[PDB]
Design a protein around this ligand. Structure first.
Ligand code: CNC
Length: 34
Protein backbone atom coordinates (compact mmCIF):
# COMPACT_ATOMS: atom_id res chain seq x y z
CA UNK A 1 0.00 0.00 0.00
CA UNK A 2 0.89 3.77 -0.06
CA UNK A 3 -1.50 6.38 1.55
CA UNK A 4 -1.99 10.20 1.51
CA UNK A 5 1.40 11.91 2.20
CA UNK A 6 1.88 15.44 3.73
CA UNK A 7 4.52 18.27 3.71
CA UNK A 8 2.71 21.69 3.75
CA UNK A 9 2.13 22.95 7.36
CA UNK A 10 4.22 21.67 10.35
CA UNK A 11 6.23 18.50 11.08
CA UNK A 12 4.60 16.90 14.26
CA UNK A 13 1.06 17.99 13.19
CA UNK A 14 1.67 16.35 9.77
CA UNK A 15 3.15 13.21 11.41
CA UNK A 16 -0.30 12.85 13.11
CA UNK A 17 -2.05 13.18 9.67
CA UNK A 18 0.12 10.46 8.03
CA UNK A 19 -0.25 8.18 11.13
CA UNK A 20 -4.06 8.66 10.84
CA UNK A 21 -3.86 7.72 7.10
CA UNK A 22 -1.69 4.69 8.13
CA UNK A 23 -4.30 3.35 10.64
CA UNK A 24 -7.14 4.04 8.11
CA UNK A 25 -5.22 2.25 5.30
CA UNK A 26 -4.60 -0.76 7.61
CA UNK A 27 -8.32 -0.94 8.72
CA UNK A 28 -9.20 -0.67 4.97
CA UNK A 29 -7.31 -3.97 4.21
CA UNK A 30 -6.31 -6.13 7.28
CA UNK A 31 -8.02 -7.21 10.54
CA UNK A 32 -5.99 -5.52 13.23
CA UNK A 33 -7.32 -2.72 15.53
CA UNK A 34 -6.14 0.49 17.26
C1 CNC B 1 10.73 8.44 0.31
O1 CNC B 1 11.64 7.32 0.83
C2 CNC B 1 10.13 9.38 1.36
O2 CNC B 1 11.00 9.69 2.47
C3 CNC B 1 11.23 11.10 2.42
N1 CNC B 1 11.61 11.54 3.78
C4 CNC B 1 10.76 11.75 4.77
N2 CNC B 1 11.42 11.99 5.90
C5 CNC B 1 12.72 11.99 5.59
C6 CNC B 1 13.87 12.32 6.28
C7 CNC B 1 15.13 12.34 5.67
C8 CNC B 1 16.34 12.83 6.45
C9 CNC B 1 15.25 12.00 4.33
C10 CNC B 1 16.62 11.94 3.65
C11 CNC B 1 14.09 11.67 3.63
C12 CNC B 1 12.84 11.68 4.24
C13 CNC B 1 9.96 11.73 1.85
O3 CNC B 1 8.79 11.81 2.70
C14 CNC B 1 9.59 10.69 0.79
O4 CNC B 1 8.15 10.60 0.58
P1 CNC B 1 7.45 10.96 -0.81
O5 CNC B 1 6.17 10.20 -0.84
O6 CNC B 1 8.44 10.69 -1.87
O7 CNC B 1 7.25 12.50 -0.64
C15 CNC B 1 6.02 12.88 -0.05
C16 CNC B 1 4.93 13.07 -1.11
C17 CNC B 1 6.18 14.22 0.68
N3 CNC B 1 6.98 14.20 1.76
C18 CNC B 1 7.27 15.29 2.48
O8 CNC B 1 7.07 16.45 2.11
C19 CNC B 1 8.01 15.03 3.79
C20 CNC B 1 6.97 14.95 4.93
C21 CNC B 1 7.51 14.64 6.34
C22 CNC B 1 6.41 15.02 7.34
C23 CNC B 1 8.04 13.23 6.66
C24 CNC B 1 7.47 11.98 6.27
C25 CNC B 1 6.02 11.90 5.79
C26 CNC B 1 8.18 10.76 6.49
N4 CNC B 1 9.43 10.70 7.10
CO1 CNC B 1 10.53 12.08 7.77
C27 CNC B 1 9.75 11.76 9.29
N5 CNC B 1 9.30 11.52 10.28
N6 CNC B 1 11.86 10.95 8.50
C28 CNC B 1 11.93 9.58 8.33
C29 CNC B 1 10.92 8.83 7.70
C30 CNC B 1 9.73 9.34 7.14
C31 CNC B 1 8.62 8.42 6.68
C32 CNC B 1 9.13 7.40 5.66
C33 CNC B 1 7.96 7.72 7.86
C34 CNC B 1 7.62 9.39 6.05
C35 CNC B 1 7.65 9.14 4.54
C36 CNC B 1 6.23 8.83 4.03
C37 CNC B 1 5.99 9.50 2.68
N7 CNC B 1 5.96 8.73 1.62
O9 CNC B 1 5.81 10.71 2.59
C38 CNC B 1 13.22 8.93 8.81
C39 CNC B 1 14.24 8.75 7.69
C40 CNC B 1 14.23 7.31 7.19
C41 CNC B 1 15.37 7.04 6.21
N8 CNC B 1 15.02 6.41 5.12
O10 CNC B 1 16.50 7.50 6.34
C42 CNC B 1 13.77 10.00 9.74
C43 CNC B 1 15.23 10.21 9.34
C44 CNC B 1 13.71 9.49 11.19
C45 CNC B 1 12.34 9.61 11.89
N9 CNC B 1 11.58 8.55 11.82
O11 CNC B 1 11.99 10.62 12.49
C46 CNC B 1 12.90 11.23 9.38
C47 CNC B 1 13.20 12.57 9.80
C48 CNC B 1 14.10 12.86 11.01
C49 CNC B 1 12.49 13.66 9.25
N10 CNC B 1 11.46 13.53 8.35
C50 CNC B 1 10.98 14.89 7.97
C51 CNC B 1 11.63 15.29 6.63
C52 CNC B 1 9.45 14.69 7.74
C53 CNC B 1 8.70 15.54 6.69
C54 CNC B 1 8.13 16.82 7.29
C55 CNC B 1 8.74 18.09 6.70
N11 CNC B 1 8.73 19.17 7.45
O12 CNC B 1 9.12 18.16 5.54
N12 CNC B 1 9.26 13.29 7.32
C56 CNC B 1 11.44 15.75 9.20
C57 CNC B 1 11.55 17.26 8.92
C58 CNC B 1 10.47 15.53 10.38
C59 CNC B 1 10.98 15.81 11.80
N13 CNC B 1 10.93 14.81 12.65
O13 CNC B 1 11.40 16.90 12.17
C60 CNC B 1 12.79 15.12 9.59
C61 CNC B 1 14.06 15.66 8.89
C62 CNC B 1 15.15 16.13 9.85
C63 CNC B 1 15.00 17.60 10.23
N14 CNC B 1 15.38 18.50 9.35
O14 CNC B 1 14.38 17.96 11.23
Amino acid sequence: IXPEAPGEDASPEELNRYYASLRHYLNLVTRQRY
